[model samples]
Target: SEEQVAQDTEEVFRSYVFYRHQQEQEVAAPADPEMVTLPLQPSSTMGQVGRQLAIIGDDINRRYDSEFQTMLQHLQPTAENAYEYFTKIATSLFESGINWGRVVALLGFGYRLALHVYQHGLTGFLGQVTRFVVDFMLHHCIARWIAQRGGWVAALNLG
Candidate 1:
């Protein structure tokens, strides 16, 4: 029974790693030439695309903030709405050509932003914020740069 449990646990972990790796590699450079590169300035626009997607990251953060505040203030139906807002925004961004690397960066940026904003209230938050920024950037950014050069390039030019 121990052997079977070990095998099952190992299988699940391997699959989790595999699935995460696949998700991580969604930003990989296609065999085709890189046709899409984001602009560094929010003032710039995506070619023929709306300003909505051009500023999707910031817009998503703002929506998340609004929903988060709603969840904080009204913890019943608003909690459900908040998570739906997160998923819907993420899916829309995916449809708009945001790849996994940028999504990961957005996650990191949001995490850091939250901590930075929250840190003034607690000393424990200071350590948490430092570790999160370093750990997130180190693992996510380096893994992205290795897996896909275009991933790094896309992030490099992000507004």
Candidate 2:
């Protein structure tokens, strides 16, 4: 009976090793690219937003791949902290009534600021970024938000 049990164990283990090797080969295969395109209504806000997100999401990914990833490589912070920082900034933007269109624009503009700073350091870029953000706020309904929430003292802080 012991000899039979040992024989059975060896057979099952050999079968499992072969099965695993086959599955591993399947997993290593490349996936198909042509899957599906989302069918959306032509004029609905939902469809528009979906399209915007898809386009902007690619832009964000590109920026991350190029600038953010490289810059982050020089930083000492943990990945989790970086994630928290990003989510917090996004939350703040949404809480401040910034829509996704504005969010992508802000991110693009922010990266431009970073690019300039990287090119020439912070001497001139800080001033330019401050002015740029102030100009955007003045245009994008954030001015009224500042006035309603914090009054003259906060407005004074902008300068």
Candidate 3:
């Protein structure tokens, strides 16, 4: 059962990574083909997608100020919502033309993302914010370059 849980968790996490990657790519494909050649790796260091997303969401939470942090309070739910969000995004991606392999790669990356977040990412800023704030912030800011490349208008819209 533990193995089954792990498998299911990985599948779910990968799906989210795949969706996130597709969204990022749609907004901004690197100008340099070489950069593109290397491929965009979405974070997925966690063994499960939910944990990976949580780690990532926490990273986002820490990077922002109190006001920005306050805005994300609603994402935290007692019930696990990763699957719900992942399913919605995956449906959109399939409708939008993303490859299945991208999703697979993302799942693996999500596991890694999970590891890096708690290990390296959550150490400083994210760590500082959690003590002051009731919940750990795990919202990711869209990058400036991604905003500029994507159709988002505001400097912070995508970043």
Candidate 4:
């Protein structure tokens, strides 16, 4: 189910962002970054997609680390205008190309935004951003493509 996949994906990234925030603040974090337990069983399709997306998201983050930081510096995102910035970000990504990679790139960008909001003391925006990412993925043309392939599970069967 795409709904379940979305929920699981959100959880995976939320936990990741939390753990990352804790590490940056020198708080007690897990010995391993991957220690956080996922909401779904590892063998399940939803779980697999969740994990793979997280991996892809991290890779995208690494590849665009400098670009993301530059954008943050220029945008100086506030809670009030963060959603608009996010919309622009998504539009830019869509303009570049629309693929599963781009979809996860949006989530990757959202992950960076969540960290920025948290580090800057913007309250309660993490969940909002997470929900927005899920909604964007589920309500966009990506959803149509996913549905055409028989949902997220089958859609992700890219071996």
Q: Of the candidates shown, which would achieve the greatest lDDT relative to the real structure?
A: 4
- The TM-scores, one per candidate, come to 0.30, 0.27, 0.23, 0.68
- True-structure lDDT of candidate 3: 0.30
Pairs clashing in candidate 2? none
Query: Considering every candidate listed, which one attains the maximal TM-score?
Result: 4
> Over the stretch 23-106, how does candidate 4's per-residue lDDT look in tens digits?
334655223222233232554556556555665455566665557667877888887898788777767877855777776667
What's the lDDT for all of these models? Answer: 0.33, 0.35, 0.30, 0.61
Of candidate 2, the 10-residue stretch with the lowest lDDT total is 30-39
The C-alpha local distance difference test score for the whole of candidate 4 amounts to 0.61
- What is candidate 3's lDDT per residue for 86-136, written digit by digit as tens? 333333323543332332323323332322333332322222221111111
**Ranking 1 against 3 by TM-score, winner:** 1
- Candidate 2, backbone clash total: 0
Over 4 Å off in model 3, which ranges?
29-159
Ranking by TM-score: 4, 1, 2, 3
Residue 2 shift from truth in candidate 2, angstroms: 88
